[PDB]
Structure 1
Amino acid sequence: VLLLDVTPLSLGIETMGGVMTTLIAKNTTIPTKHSQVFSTAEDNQSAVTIHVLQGERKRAADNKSLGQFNLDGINPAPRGMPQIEVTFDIDADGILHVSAKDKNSGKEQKITIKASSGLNEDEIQKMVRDAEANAEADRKFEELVQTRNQGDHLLHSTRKQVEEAGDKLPADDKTAIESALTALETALKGEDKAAIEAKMQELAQVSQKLMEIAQQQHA
């Protein structure tokens, strides 16, 4: 063969914090297919929005939106627990099929995106150049979002454990833990990554006894 069909730009979805998560890497030979299991961002979330992106930037807002669709009827469960398999499938004709399937409810939804969607060759070159020129600022964005997501998990799971420990947690500890949770929740609302890390570390440092109690419960 003298030529191959290949993807000029990465293809993926928007994930928690406004990030583009890639499912098909730039320069993949098509036909190609790829699935990845994702989940909900909140407790008891009953739907997910699949927002399909083309491009090389880390902020989903700086990529090219191809379309979106919702999958409904996800049964009540803690955040991160439902199993939503998302599949990108690009055929020999450059048509992209994107689907989401809830492995538990059996529900599925899908869309079809035309070969002619997304950026033209000029916009493709500009997007590559732009990603290169903002590589630092994109990397800092992605890392603030990861830190925020790790801090959010630490916060809600530490709340969950306070609740389970009940009066087994001594008064002074509950106080120090409440103080640290408040400072942490305030930091997660800012855009200062070192501050979030400082506050997560502070929560870690006053949680020793809470964690011992979780050990006793589940052990």
Structure 2
Amino acid sequence: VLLLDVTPLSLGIETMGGVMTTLIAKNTTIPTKHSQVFSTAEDNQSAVTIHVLQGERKRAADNKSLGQFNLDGINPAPRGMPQIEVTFDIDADGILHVSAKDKNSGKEQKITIKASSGLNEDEIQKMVRDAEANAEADRKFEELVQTRNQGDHLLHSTRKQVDDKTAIESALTALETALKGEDKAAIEAKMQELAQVSQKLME
């Protein structure tokens, strides 16, 4: 074969912090079916938002949206606990079916997206030449959101382990006021501090 039909671009979902986390790589041959288990970003999260994205760039907002939908009913429960199976199927006709399932509740939802949607050739050329153009660029937002997400969980997971307090609370607002920043090593520095006024709650 000289020819073959492929889904032209990365396709995935958005995850915490606003990254695109893909399920099916660009130029993958289709029909192709893929599955990936997600969980919940915050504790006692009851519902989630599955957003389908087309494109290569690390930041969700930069990729083409194909659709979105909710998965509700999830038991309130500690972040990471709920097993949320996300599945992409592209059949023959290039019809794209996404579906998210709560292993617990067994609650499930699905979206059916049209073959004709996404990016067009011109768009798909620019997506890529845009992508590698901002390679370094995007590997940067990568570890950033990695760290926000990390400091966020703490901000959260510290706040409830608590005078080394008047102090912890301090950190907490040095951490909160940094998370919002685009300076990683900062956020992480600030994390470092919390890491050491808080010992005397582990002690």
Q: Same fold (TM over 0.5)?
A: yes
The alpha carbon displacement at 1:38 in A equals: 1.0
1:80 maps to which residue?
80
The whole-number CA distance in structure 1 between the counterparts of 2:157 and 2:69 is: 30
What does the per-residue CA deviation read over 1:74-131, in whole Å, with 9 as the maximum and x for residues that have no partner?
1111233221111011112211110000000011000111221111112111110011
Q: Mean Cα displacement is larger for which, 78-87 or 10-19?
A: 78-87
Query: Which of 175, 178, 181 is equivalent to 1:184?
Result: 175
The whole-number CA distance in structure 2 between the counterparts of 1:5 and 1:109 is: 28
The alpha carbon displacement at 1:211 in A equals: 2.4
Structure number with the higher helix fraction is 1
- Name the SS for the 1:99 alignment partner: strand
The whole-number CA distance in structure 1 between the counterparts of 2:40 and 2:27 is: 30
What does the per-residue CA deviation read over 1:127-157, in whole Å, with 9 as the maximum and x for residues that have no partner?
1001111222222222211110011112211
Q: How many percent identity over aligned positions? A: 100
The alpha carbon displacement at 1:29 in A equals: 1.5
Q: Mean Cα displacement is larger for which, 119-128 or 35-44?
A: 35-44
| Rg larger for | 1
Matched, 1:205 2:196: yes
1:46-65 aligned at under 5 Å gives the runs 46-65=46-65
What does the per-residue CA deviation read over 1:16-67, in whole Å, with 9 as the maximum and x for residues that have no partner?
1111111101121222111111122233222111110010111111111001
Aligned length: 203
What does the per-residue CA deviation read over 1:139-185, in whole Å, with 9 as the maximum and x for residues that have no partner?
222221111001111221122222xxxxxxxxx33333222222112
Where structure 2 has 5 or more consecutive residues not aligned to the other structure, the ranges are none
The whole-number CA distance in structure 2 between the counterparts of 1:10 and 1:108 is: 24
The whole-number CA distance in structure 1 between the counterparts of 2:62 and 2:199 is: 42
What does the per-residue CA deviation read over 1:184-212, in whole Å, with 9 as the maximum and x for residues that have no partner?
12211222222201100111122223223
The alpha carbon displacement at 1:6 in A equals: 1.6
1:216 maps to which residue?
none
The whole-number CA distance in structure 1 between the counterparts of 2:27 and 2:120 is: 15
1:193 maps to which residue?
184
Q: Cα RMSD (Å) of the superposition? A: 1.5
Where structure 1 has 5 or more consecutive residues not aligned to the other structure, the ranges are 163-171, 213-219
